Design a protein around this ligand. Sequence first.
Ligand SMILES: Nc1ncnc2c1ncn2[C@@H]1O[C@@H](CO)[C@H](O)[C@H]1O
Ligand SMILES: [Cl-]
Length: 164
Amino acid sequence: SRIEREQHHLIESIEKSTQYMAKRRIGALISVARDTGMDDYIETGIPLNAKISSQLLINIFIPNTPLHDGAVIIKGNEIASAASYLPLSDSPFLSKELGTRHRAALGISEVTDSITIVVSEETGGISLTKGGELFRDVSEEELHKILLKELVTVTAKKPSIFSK
Ligand SMILES: Nc1ncnc2c1ncn2[C@@H]1O[C@@H](CO)[C@H](O)[C@H]1O
Ligand SMILES: [Cl-]
């Protein structure tokens, strides 16, 4: 496969699934691994090793289901695990009206270079964490630009399965 295609499909899959869940107030927590590995947190969840799709991301987070209680971790071109533990931030700067999903997303962002996306159970707002910072209630346009900048690392070049 071709990474550029993989990376844009990942972005689209996050955008479509979080849009779907935001409209319905479905809580979600999706962490995308980058240069810092998250293998230890993958091991805490239920292994999926699945192809990335918006449909599977949505089905995972349906409330009161086996896979919904925790984080999804995406590693390379797979949904690696669901219902994974992430470390909680102890920061007193995180607003008290945000839930544990936000605290978990902040916590993993403080110890990895991962990009984590949260859909709020209470408001449907979409938030993102990176490097110990929270980007709260981002618009669809803002989410798109952030994901483009952080998850697409290849410019326009010749497609090839050997790219890596
Ligand atoms: N340690 C954790 N790691 C990942 N998600 C967590 C953790 N603790 C709570 N959550 C999230 O909080 C619950 C609701 O806020 C979600 O079901 C779950 O994803
Ligand atoms: Cl929430």
